[PDB]
Design a protein around this ligand. Structure first.
Ligand SMILES: C[S@@+](CC[C@H](N)C(=O)[O-])C[C@H]1O[C@@H](n2cnc3c(N)ncnc32)[C@H](O)[C@@H]1O
Ligand SMILES: C[S@@+](CC[C@H](N)C(=O)[O-])C[C@H]1O[C@@H](n2cnc3c(N)ncnc32)[C@H](O)[C@@H]1O
Lengths: 239, 243
């Protein structure tokens, strides 16, 4: 049963049983801002709220489970002084505190492209962070393994540090992560469901979708979007 | 005058006057391994160097750090993992006052079931700018530092995949950074000079070279390599001798 719960991710995840989730693929909610350190204070207050969700994720994740976070660093130019908040970096260092093992991230190259020194380089990438729960991975059955095997060409395209062939993140981006880090039958959660990209990706490949979304309006849009992308199946929404 | 001081980055940099450096390009020393402590402690050591850099840097100048995350998989415990060195350095530089800028990704290295490990292909080129106002170069500095259109668009992009790996970094990557973030005549600093790639890169492009290197044997290799790759000029190595 593909589920999507409406409510605060921190509260909802709190009502789920430990080690019942195999994979988390998600994108942290949008964060936007006279003023000295007032900005970084709100910034670190944001991180404090994300940490609460990551902490719950570390609980409901099975050992060997993984938390995948797709994040771009928040830039702010004309304090008109150009400044970039290193979100991906902060999230990485903070997850170590929650007990996650950090793995190499995959660089999502989203945007491909007075000539004097000092020019600002435009943002072209988002980071796909990988945080693993240690302890000793579970073992999928022979059938699960066989049905989750990736064709050679897809394997070599997916498992590389930089993805430059995928211009809310795209379904194809989510389908890759679901296929790379879970097996058919596994539960794939997204604490910040949005329009349900991850749920659609998970459901589409024989995994069980489990999501949480704050705004009830978006929850409904996802169910409809879900019913279109997942022919025959439906997205159960509750509060 | 291009100089290389043989000594400890923390102590040696402490003696230089504030706001006397325009650009710092460097690669922190090799990190080798409870273990998080050895790690957090190494980070603490590095911070003592960044602190001096922030003071030594003129407003608007920057600290460029090329680091690859240290993967020590299947080693200690019974699992693979990676120390996010680049991420830890980025967070810690903010606490020191630096303005974080977007990093450049150096694409160094260009079953079939779920869970496979992805091998390291990249290194990070961290950019930490010291706030304090824009920069102020002469007209001749602008005319002589101005980059041709083709080069500008080849350098000012977030991913570099045209510079093959293998001295944590090539002369081409250093020379590229020097042309992008300093002006002819400025002072370029590398507190961890090693064989002096940064020093050489600065000199070949009309910038004043400055550096620190703990190992005299490396500094000497630096002096000789410099002289080899910097015709007409020599690298002055200062032990600090007297008498
Ligand atoms: C980056 S978006 C998710 C996008 C995903 N790629 C998709 O296609 O849906 C983050 C979501 O978190 C929601 N949000 C913000 N604060 C929340 C909270 N405390 N609990 C749950 N959702 C929250 C926002 O409404 C938003 O839809
Ligand atoms: C990654 S290497 C720099 C290599 C450089 N890219 C080159 O072309 O040789 C770091 C350097 O820092 C030096 N080092 C380590 N600890 C130091 C310290 N406390 N003070 C000064 N140098 C130190 C090491 O001897 C080493 O050569």
């Amino acid at each position: 049963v593909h589920r999507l719960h409406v409510g605060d991710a921190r509260e909802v995840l709190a009502s789920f049983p430990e080690a019942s989730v195999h994979l988390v693929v998600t994108s942290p909610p949008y964060w936007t801002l006279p003023g000295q350190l007032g900005h970084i204070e709100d910034y670190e207050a944001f991180l404090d709220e994300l940490d609460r969700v990551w902490r719950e994720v570390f609980r409901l994740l099975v050992p060997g489970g993984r938390l995948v976070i797709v994040v771009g660093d928040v830039a702010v130019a004309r304090f008109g002084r150009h400044l970039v908040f290193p979100l991906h970096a902060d999230i990485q260092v903070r997850c170590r505190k929650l007990g996650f093992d950090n793995l190499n991230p995959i660089i999502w190259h989203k945007h491909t492209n007075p000539y004097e020194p000092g020019a600002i380089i435009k943002t072209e990438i988002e980071y796909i962070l990988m945080q693993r729960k240690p302890g000793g991975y579970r073992k999928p059955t022979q059938e699960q393994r066989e049905k989750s095997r990736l064709p050679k060409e897809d394997f070599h395209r997916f498992f590389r540090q930089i993805w430059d062939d995928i211009p809310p993140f795209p379904l194809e981006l989510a389908e890759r992560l679901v296929r790379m880090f879970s097996f058919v039958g596994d539960v794939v959660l997204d604490p910040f469901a949005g329009t349900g990209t991850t749920l659609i990706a998970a459901a589409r490949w024989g995994r069980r979708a489990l999501g949480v979304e704050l705004v009830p309006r978006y929850a409904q849009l996802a169910k409809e979007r879900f019913a279109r992308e997942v022919p025959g199946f439906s997205l159960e929404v509750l509060d």
